Scaffold this active site. Structure first.
Site, PDB file in Angstrom:
ATOM      1  N   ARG A   1      -3.468  -1.138   5.462  1.00  0.00           N
ATOM      2  CA  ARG A   1      -3.948  -2.300   4.712  1.00  0.00           C
ATOM      3  C   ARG A   1      -2.899  -3.378   4.473  1.00  0.00           C
ATOM      4  O   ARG A   1      -3.147  -4.540   4.770  1.00  0.00           O
ATOM      5  CB  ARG A   1      -4.603  -1.903   3.386  1.00  0.00           C
ATOM      6  CG  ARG A   1      -5.932  -1.167   3.563  1.00  0.00           C
ATOM      7  CD  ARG A   1      -6.442  -0.651   2.233  1.00  0.00           C
ATOM      8  NE  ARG A   1      -5.673   0.497   1.764  1.00  0.00           N
ATOM      9  CZ  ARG A   1      -6.039   1.269   0.749  1.00  0.00           C
ATOM     10  NH1 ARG A   1      -7.169   1.017   0.099  1.00  0.00           N
ATOM     11  NH2 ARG A   1      -5.284   2.299   0.399  1.00  0.00           N
TER      12      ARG A   1
ATOM     13  N   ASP B   1     -10.491   1.588   1.903  1.00  0.00           N
ATOM     14  CA  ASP B   1      -9.531   2.520   2.491  1.00  0.00           C
ATOM     15  C   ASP B   1     -10.110   3.185   3.737  1.00  0.00           C
ATOM     16  O   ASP B   1     -11.052   3.975   3.642  1.00  0.00           O
ATOM     17  CB  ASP B   1      -9.169   3.604   1.470  1.00  0.00           C
ATOM     18  CG  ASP B   1      -7.965   4.421   1.888  1.00  0.00           C
ATOM     19  OD1 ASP B   1      -7.564   4.355   3.065  1.00  0.00           O
ATOM     20  OD2 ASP B   1      -7.414   5.149   1.039  1.00  0.00           O
TER      21      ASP B   1
ATOM     22  N   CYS C   1       0.868  -1.180   0.000  1.00  0.00           N
ATOM     23  CA  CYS C   1       0.000   0.000   0.000  1.00  0.00           C
ATOM     24  C   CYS C   1       0.901   1.225   0.000  1.00  0.00           C
ATOM     25  O   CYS C   1       2.012   1.134  -0.488  1.00  0.00           O
ATOM     26  CB  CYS C   1      -1.016   0.002   1.150  1.00  0.00           C
ATOM     27  SG  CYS C   1      -0.353  -0.035   2.828  1.00  0.00           S
TER      28      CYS C   1
END
EC number: 3.9.1.2
Lengths: 154, 154
Positions: free
Chosen positions: B14, B116, B8
């Site tokens: 993440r 997100d 990421c």
């Protein structure tokens, strides 16, 4: 003393053009660098960027740089090509939040992005160059006006 | 052998969750790392990432890493959290193009981005974790099916 840092992603197209256009003016008391948020070291500016700069008499001998802490500390103003770049820079280097702007917002006061010409034909690069030149002219006027206004001593 | 690299931007949210979920399975013949396209070195996973991992029994050590050429060369598969990340990786490291996918595209054949949280509420971290758990279960099945199919001899 101004230390202007122009930032895009790869530091081969938009930010090297911005830097070359500003550097070409040879403004006293202004130093110019560029870097990329995700960039190789030592790459040339892209061929279309070099060509459209050459049309304006500029041959900058650019070498790409990854944006690092050292550049952030060096800068008085970090001028990002887009709001997305601005956001990335501020997230990665929160200490830079007070001095990081998009180029358009810093000179005009209004939000805006410089479009990415990467992968495009020469006229797309020429369009980006023209947008940048207008903004850099306005930037130069902004900086010099400030310099003159606050000039003292002898 | 598999060397799975999850990617990421900041390598705090993440991708560390993805790496932790896969590593927790302790799949034979599978090594896992994560890195960020624009990340500090040595940062912990964010608190909400740690919390939602804790809910599933995972309390792994994470130190953030900036994505470098060395990670790209190590990986057999570079699994990006989003198409944007995939596109950045391939533009920066063209040599990685054949082995860089979004996690979603690699296990499902359609595309999609992992939710997100934007550093937001724990609920969005949990949503992202749940998406990742589903995809990582499918990833495990995919890799082990391949391993079993091509297993030969004592």
């Amino acid at each position: 003393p101004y230390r202007i840092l122009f930032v895009c992603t790869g530091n081969t197209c938009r930010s090297p053009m911005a830097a070359a256009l500003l550097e070409n003016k040879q403004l006293p008391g202004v130093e110019v660098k560029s870097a990329g948020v995700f960039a190789a070291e030592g790459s040339e500016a892209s061929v279309h960027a070099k060509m459209v700069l050459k049309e304006k008499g500029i041959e900058a001998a650019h070498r790409s740089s990854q944006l690092k802490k050292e550049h952030i500390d060096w800068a008085t103003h970090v001028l990002a090509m887009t709001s997305g770049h601005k956001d990335m820079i501020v997230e990665r280097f929160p200490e830079a939040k007070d001095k990081t702007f998009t180029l358009k917002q810093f000179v005009s006061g209004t939000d805006g992005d410089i479009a990415d010409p990467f992968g495009g034909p020469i006229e797309v690069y020429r369009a980006a160059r023209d947008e940048l030149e207008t903004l850099i002219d306005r930037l130069a006027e902004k900086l010099q006006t400030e310099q003159l206004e606050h000039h003292h001593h002898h």
